Amino acid sequence: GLFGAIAGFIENGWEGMIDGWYGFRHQNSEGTGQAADLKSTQAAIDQINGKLNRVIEKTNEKFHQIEKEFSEVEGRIQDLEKYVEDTKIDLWSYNAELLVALENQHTIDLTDSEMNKLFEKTRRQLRENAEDMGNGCFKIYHKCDNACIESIRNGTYDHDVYRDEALNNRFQI
Amino acid sequence: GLFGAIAGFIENGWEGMIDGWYGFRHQNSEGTGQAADLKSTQAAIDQINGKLNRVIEKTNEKFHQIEKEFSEVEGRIQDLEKYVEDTKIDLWSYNAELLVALENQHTIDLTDSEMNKLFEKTRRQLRENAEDMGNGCFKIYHKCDNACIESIRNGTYDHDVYRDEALNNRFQI
Amino acid sequence: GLFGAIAGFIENGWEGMIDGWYGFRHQNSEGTGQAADLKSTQAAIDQINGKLNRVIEKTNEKFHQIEKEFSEVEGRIQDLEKYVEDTKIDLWSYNAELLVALENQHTIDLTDSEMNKLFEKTRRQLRENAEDMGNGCFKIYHKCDNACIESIRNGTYDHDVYRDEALNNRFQI
Amino acid sequence: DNSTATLCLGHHAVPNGTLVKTITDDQIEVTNATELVQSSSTGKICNNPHRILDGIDCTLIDALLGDPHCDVFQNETWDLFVERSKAFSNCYPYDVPDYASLRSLVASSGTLEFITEGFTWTGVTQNGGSNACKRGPSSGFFSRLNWLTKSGSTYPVLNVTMPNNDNFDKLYIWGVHHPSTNQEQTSLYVQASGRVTVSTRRSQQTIIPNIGSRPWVRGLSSRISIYWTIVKPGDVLVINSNGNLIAPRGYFKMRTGKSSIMRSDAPIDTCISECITPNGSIPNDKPFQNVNKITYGACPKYVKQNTLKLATGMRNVPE
Amino acid sequence: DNSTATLCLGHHAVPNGTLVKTITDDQIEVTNATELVQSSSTGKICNNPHRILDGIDCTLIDALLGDPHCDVFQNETWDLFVERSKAFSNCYPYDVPDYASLRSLVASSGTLEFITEGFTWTGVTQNGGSNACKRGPSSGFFSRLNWLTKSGSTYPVLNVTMPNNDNFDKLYIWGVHHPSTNQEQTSLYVQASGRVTVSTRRSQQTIIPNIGSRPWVRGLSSRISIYWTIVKPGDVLVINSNGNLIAPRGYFKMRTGKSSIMRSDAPIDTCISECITPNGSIPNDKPFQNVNKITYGACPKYVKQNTLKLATGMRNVPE
Amino acid sequence: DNSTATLCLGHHAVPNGTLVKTITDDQIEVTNATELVQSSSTGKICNNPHRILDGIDCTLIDALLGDPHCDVFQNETWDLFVERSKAFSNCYPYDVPDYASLRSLVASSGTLEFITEGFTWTGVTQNGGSNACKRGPSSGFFSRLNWLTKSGSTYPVLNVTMPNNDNFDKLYIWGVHHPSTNQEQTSLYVQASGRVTVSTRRSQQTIIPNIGSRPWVRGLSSRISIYWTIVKPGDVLVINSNGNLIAPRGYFKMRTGKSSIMRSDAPIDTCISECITPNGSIPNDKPFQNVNKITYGACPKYVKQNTLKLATGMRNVPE
Ligand SMILES: *[C@@H]1O[C@H](CO[C@@H]2O[C@@H](C)[C@@H](O)[C@@H](O)[C@@H]2O)[C@@H](O[C@@H]2O[C@H](CO)[C@@H](O[C@@H]3O[C@H](CO[C@H]4O[C@H](CO)[C@@H](O)[C@H](O)[C@@H]4O[C@@H]4O[C@H](CO)[C@@H](O[C@@H]5O[C@H](CO)[C@H](O)[C@H](O)[C@H]5O)[C@H](O)[C@H]4NC(C)=O)[C@@H](O)[C@H](O[C@H]4O[C@H](CO)[C@@H](O)[C@H](O)[C@@H]4O[C@@H]4O[C@H](CO)[C@@H](O)[C@H](O)[C@H]4NC(C)=O)[C@@H]3O)[C@H](O)[C@H]2NC(C)=O)[C@H](O)[C@H]1NC(C)=O
Ligand SMILES: *[C@@H]1O[C@H](CO[C@@H]2O[C@@H](C)[C@@H](O)[C@@H](O)[C@@H]2O)[C@@H](O[C@@H]2O[C@H](CO)[C@@H](O[C@@H]3O[C@H](CO[C@H]4O[C@H](CO)[C@@H](O)[C@H](O)[C@@H]4O[C@@H]4O[C@H](CO)[C@@H](O[C@@H]5O[C@H](CO)[C@H](O)[C@H](O)[C@H]5O)[C@H](O)[C@H]4NC(C)=O)[C@@H](O)[C@H](O[C@H]4O[C@H](CO)[C@@H](O)[C@H](O)[C@@H]4O[C@@H]4O[C@H](CO)[C@@H](O)[C@H](O)[C@H]4NC(C)=O)[C@@H]3O)[C@H](O)[C@H]2NC(C)=O)[C@H](O)[C@H]1NC(C)=O
Ligand SMILES: *[C@@H]1O[C@H](CO[C@@H]2O[C@@H](C)[C@@H](O)[C@@H](O)[C@@H]2O)[C@@H](O[C@@H]2O[C@H](CO)[C@@H](O[C@@H]3O[C@H](CO[C@H]4O[C@H](CO)[C@@H](O)[C@H](O)[C@@H]4O[C@@H]4O[C@H](CO)[C@@H](O[C@@H]5O[C@H](CO)[C@H](O)[C@H](O)[C@H]5O)[C@H](O)[C@H]4NC(C)=O)[C@@H](O)[C@H](O[C@H]4O[C@H](CO)[C@@H](O)[C@H](O)[C@@H]4O[C@@H]4O[C@H](CO)[C@@H](O)[C@H](O)[C@H]4NC(C)=O)[C@@H]3O)[C@H](O)[C@H]2NC(C)=O)[C@H](O)[C@H]1NC(C)=O
Ligand SMILES: *[C@@H]1O[C@H](CO)[C@@H](O[C@@H]2O[C@H](CO)[C@@H](O[C@@H]3O[C@H](CO[C@H]4O[C@H](CO)[C@@H](O)[C@H](O)[C@@H]4O)[C@@H](O)[C@H](O)[C@@H]3O)[C@H](O)[C@H]2NC(C)=O)[C@H](O)[C@H]1NC(C)=O
Ligand SMILES: *[C@@H]1O[C@H](CO)[C@@H](O[C@@H]2O[C@H](CO)[C@@H](O[C@@H]3O[C@H](CO[C@H]4O[C@H](CO)[C@@H](O)[C@H](O)[C@@H]4O)[C@@H](O)[C@H](O)[C@@H]3O)[C@H](O)[C@H]2NC(C)=O)[C@H](O)[C@H]1NC(C)=O
Ligand SMILES: *[C@@H]1O[C@H](CO)[C@@H](O[C@@H]2O[C@H](CO)[C@@H](O)[C@H](O)[C@H]2NC(C)=O)[C@H](O)[C@H]1NC(C)=O
Ligand SMILES: *[C@@H]1O[C@H](CO)[C@@H](O[C@@H]2O[C@H](CO)[C@@H](O)[C@H](O)[C@H]2NC(C)=O)[C@H](O)[C@H]1NC(C)=O
Ligand SMILES: *[C@@H]1O[C@H](CO)[C@@H](O[C@@H]2O[C@H](CO)[C@@H](O)[C@H](O)[C@H]2NC(C)=O)[C@H](O)[C@H]1NC(C)=O
Ligand SMILES: *[C@@H]1O[C@H](CO)[C@@H](O)[C@H](O)[C@H]1NC(C)=O
Ligand SMILES: *[C@@H]1O[C@H](CO)[C@@H](O)[C@H](O)[C@H]1NC(C)=O
Numbered sequence A, B, C: 001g002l003f004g005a006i007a008g009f010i011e012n013g014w015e016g017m018i019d020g021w022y023g024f025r026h027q028n029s030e031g032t033g034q035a036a037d038l039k040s041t042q043a044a045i046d047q048i049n050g051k052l053n054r055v056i057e058k059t060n061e062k063f064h065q066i067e068k069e070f071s072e073v074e075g076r077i078q079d080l081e082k083y084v085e086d087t088k089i090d091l092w093s094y095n096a097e098l099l100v101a102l103e104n105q106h107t108i109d110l111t112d113s114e115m116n117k118l119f120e121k122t123r124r125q126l127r128e129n130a131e132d133m134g135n136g137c138f139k140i141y142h143k144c145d146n147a148c149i150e151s152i153r154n155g156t157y158d159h160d161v162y163r164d165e166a167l168n169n170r171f172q173i
Numbered sequence D, E, F: 001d002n003s004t005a006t007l008c009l010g011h012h013a014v015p016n017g018t019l020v021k022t023i024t025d026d027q028i029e030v031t032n033a034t035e036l037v038q039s040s041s042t043g044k045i046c047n048n049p050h051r052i053l054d055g056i057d058c059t060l061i062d063a064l065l066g067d068p069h070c071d072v073f074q075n076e077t078w079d080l081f082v083e084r085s086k087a088f089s090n091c092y093p094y095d096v097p098d099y100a101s102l103r104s105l106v107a108s109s110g111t112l113e114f115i116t117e118g119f120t121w122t123g124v125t126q127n128g129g130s131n132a133c134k135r136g137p138s139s140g141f142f143s144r145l146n147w148l149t150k151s152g153s154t155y156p157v158l159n160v161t162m163p164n165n166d167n168f169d170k171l172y173i174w175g176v177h178h179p180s181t182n183q184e185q186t187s188l189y190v191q192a193s194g195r196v197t198v199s200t201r202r203s204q205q206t207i208i209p210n211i212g213s214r215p216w217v218r219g220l221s222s223r224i225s226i227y228w229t230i231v232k233p234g235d236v237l238v239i240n241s242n243g244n245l246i247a248p249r250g251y252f253k254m255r256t257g258k259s260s261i262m263r264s265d266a267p268i269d270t271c272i273s274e275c276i277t278p279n280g281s282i283p284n285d286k287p288f289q290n291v292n293k294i295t296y297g298a299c300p301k302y303v304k305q306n307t308l309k310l311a312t313g314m315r316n317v318p319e
């Protein structure tokens, strides 16, 4: 994936996470959490839904066409009927093959992106109070209980409250 | 957009900004500014133009073709003429439909990227003298008049000059 | 490229770098180094290989087709034979044009991405011991000989060892 | 009070997972996919929403002409006419120059309404029957055709007209007799060399009959060749003949519609399925199909591939 | 003395904006777009850059043969022949087996240059006219055709040759007469059963005439069938006939052009439009068009959709 | 003791580089690419892996019928039949109504196996020859054809059957003679007006001969028209004639195969190339090809472009 999150700096997925597509495993003083993020999961779902609907969109409708099977041998006109039918099937076959190839490549990059968006959104939300470990986890340099973790999750984290404490914890010799 | 800038961490656009595609709204001690960035705008316009030309590039040119309308009922040969015409129109209709879909999706991610490029370019230019608020704005932790803001805009911002002042302003208890 | 690395914040490539696609030019106290990164180069080679193979993948095979050249003038049936052949060739010609257009756009973005992946991976590795200059170079704010540079290169860099010295070097008035 | 905290971000993986084709990857595993190629069928044709006519043991041509065992199909109408493989002809032996075209053009018309017109056949005997085409107790002929023999011993030069004074097109189906022996030729038609001309104002066609033995088809060496002439509104149909003419009783109406014909042995069922294939009705929820290139209705595009997975989830990276 | 500063980055939005189709989105608003489908026409055909020939009230076929009112078209040349629906025929009643092919192959030739060759018709009367085909004061015939009747009361077996000793192809247009009555048949041709053979060294074709009534077309029940034979450089044309022969006066030249024909009633104007359609000329600035599948010149591809917006700006996110 | 360090990240550039088309760029330089359009040929046709048959100076039709110089091709078999332009005919002058179709269906058969069937011709002379068709010392005829003249001075009405009691399809190739003069017509066939009917139980065709001059081809004005009839397993072949019949000696076998025919003058070589083109064999390592639209075997798609570079490296940005 073009963003190197899924199968990138995040080494693996979480077979435990049933509640959604993207989320948070945490570790603090008061224990352990694990919740799925709705806003990023939804985004990834609507877009894939949206693109599934585009592909499933009712393609056209024919009725009386040419005959496509023959019991007898006729030569020229029949030759032309078969060649028309064959090149038609070939071009559709290439369209179908190329469609999924493109779509799938994109679906992959779409989801990789959505994972990166959730990361950079959280990174900015934390400001100076945390550091990127490299593996998709931060180290929050302050006291951050389940109620604190929650505030990050629901988007309502105030970095000023913790700044003095975290900033100070981050620079010690 | 794959980069989450436009319609992402930048909540909305600026109907005011007539002078260009990407730019800077600011707020300092000496008042208010607002200018558009040329390099990023140009980049986005050239590529969109570059791709417009590709699409408008004169396709093929026929002359004597088959007949496509018939006053009489003729059966088999006419069935073949019509079917050939219909499958051709369908395969072109798909190509046209899939073209804009691919092109449009790209055009969006392209502009999203160009936005993101400008952001990261500015982020690197500021080094330690600023912080990302999350909404596509920085807090420049030093004194930065219209002449200072300008230097960022035109790419000639010297972070050393301000580092000691900003660095010191950033870590106070 | 969508990521703004190659032909972006890295102003030029390195005609010297024969050993690989991506890599490191360094400058420390003990001298000068230059190596190519295997993992990112491989990722970028396997993908381009992976897609070359998809494209070269045996397309179909015909045998007895229609005739495509005529010494006599015949009218209707021949008109239909030629038009079938001509429109077939055109749809293939468009597929071939649009294929490389998409493929090439992607190959470019893919390699731009792989460059960006290597960059952010290094950024994360260094943690607090370095700063982004803007041109794809870090200033490592501590002492970092050839053995130290190597540790970054092979992924086994310990930021704790150097943090105190670097962190301290980074903030002096 | 002195400690930190860890916050990890991540995505989900699955135990199973699905291989999928990408642009750079032949096969690669994702969280989930859906099949884009429809590759199975119910095995039978739904009676909806199309108007289906099961030809049972009649071909559209036999039904058209009026083969006695096809008498049920008089004036019938269809969206799809289904021809079964067990179909047999049991009338006078026949053949159609461009059989294919007649079968096609009538298929598309999607109607067998026959309007009987008062043609006058001066000085020739009508309603010629035959043991090779039984009608109940006695013998007969095609219902939409009039077999003309001679009067006393005189078969005059037939000169008849029928102008199209309506606003629709007319379809006339008429024939030419080819006797086995010169002995037979004269007994029915007098002149040992017959001739049939049928014409409009725009075009014509003259058929000269050809005496000689064909192989035994229903105890007969003789044949009837079937021909068709369409008459536009305001045009006229002229029929000439000094012998061997199989007269039309009138015309068939023509419709420009969405109707057609299909060879299939699939049963017919009570259900609704927009897309029909000779293998049975198929669902059209997918863009592509691998069942049969021959289709009727709003169908998926026929494609060579039997499977084609569209990723509906992220890349799957397991523990 | 101490304070900070704020620098925001952003993009522009618009008050209006355009809905657009994407890969994940049926409709989604962007800053601006352009139409990729050309869906309107001027209504008239520009006289440039193509050489247009207005048939007015003449079909190409009538102009070819030399219907008196189509005499203006002698030796004419075109890139596009425009056929109007107000076109009539006002010569001897006729039909063409494969009219379509003739009309086509002549269209592609893009020329009506006729070369008069000294054919010799021994023992037969030439230049037969008719009131159904008036020429100025008296009555006439097709200009590119010779009507052969008999001499005194004898119509010999016509046996003539005309070798193609040139380096280009020759196009020969000839006919066969079908009389109404056996009375008419012998009065012109003696032998009650005529015959026409026309042949090269590579192929041949023999047409036997067919007597009988057709419907009144310009007061006549008789018809003329029209046929064509192309003669390669080096080959020879042979013409046999014991009667009913409508002789050629020479040949038409052939060109392998980019020329063609089009049915349309659009007026013709003074302007330059490369792409032509029966609805009139259309500009070719767009890749796709929805006006008409029938086109001439360097044209956009015909497509089923009436509109297809291509995004020329970012996603639009308003305040 | 104060020290820092610098770590730069970069990518490679090349001195040369390659221009490439993109979605947003007409031309743009990358680090490397490969050709996707195969545009040159070896000039010769590899004898593998297909079974190639070089017609030399024989056409498939001449070889079929049995033109004496084409006697080498008896019972022959091909995947590809290569027709050379130096090919001539040196038997009785002939033409084939729908030559193109015959040439094709036999091409696809891929075999010239001929089964001699003991036909019985009562009261007529067989094995008619001609000087326009020399067989070694004396004269002769096509090998797969029997030329029937009269006995003493009588030519009875020929009535023969040949029922297909096998499980494969039969291909019968038979003819009809067109004499120059009525003087010739009677000298061979008695009845001045011959007639040939060939029929199965499904369909039929009668050919009436046409007397008259054609141009001198091998010193002759007469012609033979060639026709074909396929007979399904179970069906019967009937042949009637009161003159002018060119009898079949038996039938050809039929195979539904991958076999075909191609016009080309390329020499044939010892090598293996799956894909064949009239220009010679071409490799198929590329998905597209610009050599020729006419191909045989597993070939790349013919495409209008001579070149189509696919980037195999990053964007090139040099010092
Ligand atoms: C299939 O469809 C066709 C066509 O129908 C059309 O399409 C369908 C889908 C519907 O939409 C329908 O509405 C459309 O019309 C149907 O074909 C009809 O078939 C019936 C019988 O099955 C025919 O009726 C018999 O006609 C005999 C004589 O026919 C005409 O010719 C004589 C000259 O010989 C004239 O003098 C007559 O007047 C008849 O003239 C016809 O009259 C029609 C009605 O006015 C006209 O049709 C109308 O045309 C207009 C256009 O303006 C519209 O289109 C109308 O909708 C349309 O109906 C027609 O043009 C005209 N034809 C001609 C050539 O002039 C009758 O003799 C015979 O009567 C006997 O039987 C009766 C019992 O049923 C009985 O009441 C009578 O007394 C008489 O009895 C006989 O008496 C003698 C005494 O000596 C005895 O010896 C006999 O034994 C005895 N016989 C019997 C049987 O007892 C019939 O009425 C009808 O003509 C025919 N119409 C057409 C147009 O073809 C067909 O029904 C459908 N098939 C099926 C299976 O459903
Ligand atoms: C349309 O084009 C066609 C074809 O032309 C070609 O295409 C065009 C587009 C141009 O590119 C052009 O350059 C091409 O050539 C044109 O068709 C021509 O039409 C004119 C008249 O309109 C014809 O001229 C008349 O010929 C009569 C005799 O016909 C021939 O046959 C007799 C035997 O019976 C011979 O004795 C004659 O010599 C004629 O022979 C022909 O001569 C041609 C000229 O050399 C030859 O053509 C040339 O051929 C070579 C081949 O190598 C090249 O191809 C050249 O390019 C080509 O020009 C031709 O091969 C040859 N044919 C044969 C079979 O041998 C004449 O009798 C008659 O003359 C009368 O009228 C004159 C006044 O106009 C007058 O001056 C004469 O004195 C004479 O007067 C008559 O005299 C009698 C005496 O008894 C009096 O009683 C009468 O009252 C009196 N009559 C009149 C009316 O006053 C004509 O000259 C010409 O033959 C014909 N050519 C071809 C090739 O078909 C046509 O012009 C174009 N149409 C339009 C609307 O523009
Ligand atoms: C091309 O292939 C064709 C077809 O072959 C098939 O396809 C190929 C690919 C192979 O797979 C092959 O196996 C397949 O079979 C070949 O065609 C064959 O050609 C040979 C000779 O080249 C023919 O043999 C001559 O037959 C003469 C008599 O003809 C028949 O009719 C009379 C009545 O008029 C009967 O009485 C005869 O018995 C003959 O009847 C035929 O007999 C065949 C053998 O059984 C039957 O064929 C078989 O059919 C079965 C089906 O059940 C299978 O399909 C088999 O595979 C198939 O072989 C055939 O059905 C049957 N037909 C009928 C109608 O009954 C003979 O007289 C003549 O013999 C003379 O020459 C001999 C020298 O070689 C000599 O030994 C004899 O004694 C005799 O000598 C003559 O004597 C007189 C006496 O007075 C002298 O005056 C003469 O001078 C003297 N002559 C000579 C020359 O010295 C031949 O044997 C054969 O009929 C024919 N078969 C078929 C099926 O068409 C062909 O060979 C291949 N071409 C090439 C170039 O390779
Ligand atoms: C829907 O219906 C379509 C039309 O029927 C299906 O396509 C058809 O599939 C059949 C396969 O059964 C093809 O029929 C032929 O099969 C014979 C093989 O049978 C004989 O040969 C073997 C040799 O191993 C022998 O052992 C046996 O005893 C048999 O005698 C082949 O010889 C033929 O070449 C041919 O393949 C049809 O050709 C095929 N039609 C088309 C147009 O492809 C379709 O697959 C059905 N799909 C579904 C989902 O139901
Ligand atoms: C450019 O020219 C093309 C060729 O003319 C155009 O395509 C054609 O468009 C016409 C539209 O009229 C179609 O013609 C027919 O329309 C009648 C409708 O009239 C009758 O029905 C109504 C019912 O409301 C009734 O009230 C009236 O009294 C009439 O009886 C239909 O009955 C016909 O089925 C038919 O649709 C042509 O079909 C169509 N051509 C083709 C090949 O489909 C094209 O649209 C023009 N484009 C532009 C931009 O000018
Ligand atoms: C011409 O030949 C055919 C076939 O040899 C003869 O028709 C056969 O006649 C017998 C009894 O009359 C039937 O049992 C056969 O079934 C017929 N065979 C076929 C193929 O039709 C016929 O007698 C001959 N005709 C003439 C006029 O001589
Ligand atoms: C055969 O029938 C046709 C058609 O009825 C006759 O032609 C009509 O003749 C009269 C004048 O005698 C014209 O007014 C009509 O318009 C003609 N009808 C048509 C349809 O053209 C013709 O007279 C008959 N011919 C013979 C030889 O008997
Ligand atoms: C009909 O005309 C043709 C052509 O003029 C005559 O055939 C020519 O005959 C001579 C020898 O007699 C040959 O040298 C020529 O080559 C022939 N010409 C062609 C084109 O073949 C033929 O003799 C005439 N036929 C009749 C029956 O009168
Ligand atoms: C977000 O989480 C915090 C901490 O758990 C809590 O105060 C509140 O429920 C949430 N905020 C809002 C606005 O719902
Ligand atoms: C950039 O802006 C600064 C501040 O106004 C000014 O000194 C200078 O004109 C600009 N730099 C360049 C290189 O023009």
Ligand SMILES: *[C@@H]1O[C@H](CO)[C@@H](O)[C@H](O)[C@H]1NC(C)=O
Pocket: C147, C148, C150, C151, C154, C156
């Ligand atoms: C990484 O580089 C360091 C310094 O050169 C070296 O000690 C070590 O062997 C390398 N690590 C691994 C895992 O190979």
Ligand SMILES: *[C@@H]1O[C@H](CO)[C@@H](O)[C@H](O)[C@H]1NC(C)=O
Pocket: F032, F033, F312, F313
């Ligand atoms: C192009 O192919 C490879 C892959 O990019 C590259 O190393 C080389 O320079 C080019 N040419 C070759 C292998 O001939």
